[PDB]
Design a binder for this molecule. Structure first.
Ligand SMILES: O=C1N2C=C(c3ccc(O)cc3)NC(Cc3ccccc3)C2=N[C@@]1(Cc1ccc(I)cc1)OO
Length: 191
């Protein structure tokens, strides 16, 4: 493994990062969300906003299913916040265990599915314009200034693109470990 990654689950900034996303996902403020909702959102984005082919979409659907599945979410079950954060602890642990063993993470598998859609050249790397299009469709970032910040935090190549290898490392830090160097990955959009 290239980094030594450990969890920080009692940090209120980690709990609150995921609470921010819970709220963002719970668009109708039911105080619960379902797997049905999460995979609908994923496929709506990629099929109806980003031009994914049927095969590309199904590959993406499987990845998103497995991801939220790893956090304990299930079709036909309504997950509340206390269940959600408990499930996220299990997902993060499981992911850091894979990473430490140089085994592919659920977030990497999602990223490969998504980048094949979003990268016009299908080489595992995105432009700023492609990142805006995705994050704005998803709604995880709203402003162009915040998308721009992603490219500052991340280590870009001579060509000016964001490689899947680099994004994954940042994602591991941001979502799973509270690594200080990954702060502001989505700019002001997600604390
Ligand atoms: O990393 C990403 N997340 C993480 C999250 C996320 C993380 C933690 C959390 O508690 C909730 C959501 N959400 C979204 C948006 C989303 C949500 C549901 C269905 C479709 C798109 C999300 N989109 C992603 C997609 C992605 C996935 C892997 C890679 I490497 C690069 C990009 O962009 O930052």
């Amino acid at each position: 493994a290239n980094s030594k990654l450990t969890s920080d689950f009692d940090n209120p900034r980690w709990i609150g990062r995921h609470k921010h996303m819970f709220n963002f996902l719970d668009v109708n403020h039911n105080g619960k969300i379902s797997l049905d909702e999460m995979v609908y959102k994923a496929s709506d984005i990629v099929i109806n906003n980003l031009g994914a082919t049927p095969e590309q979409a199904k590959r993406h659907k499987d990845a998103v299913e497995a991801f939220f599945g790893g956090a304990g979410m299930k079709y036909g079950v309504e997950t509340d916040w206390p269940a959600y954060i408990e499930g996220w602890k299990k997902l993060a642990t499981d992911e850091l265990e894979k990473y430490a063993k140089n085994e592919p993470t659920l977030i990497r598998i999602w990223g490969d599915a998504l980048f094949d859609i979003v990268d016009k050249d299908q080489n595992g790397a995105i432009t700023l314009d492609e990142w805006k299009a995705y994050t704005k469709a998803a709604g995880i970032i709203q402003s162009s200034e915040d998308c721009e910040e992603t490219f500052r935090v991340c280590d870009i190549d001579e060509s000016g693109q964001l490689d899947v290898d680099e994004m994954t490392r940042q994602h591991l830090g941001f979502w799973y470990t509270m690594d200080p160097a990954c702060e502001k990955l989505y700019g002001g959009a997600v604390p």
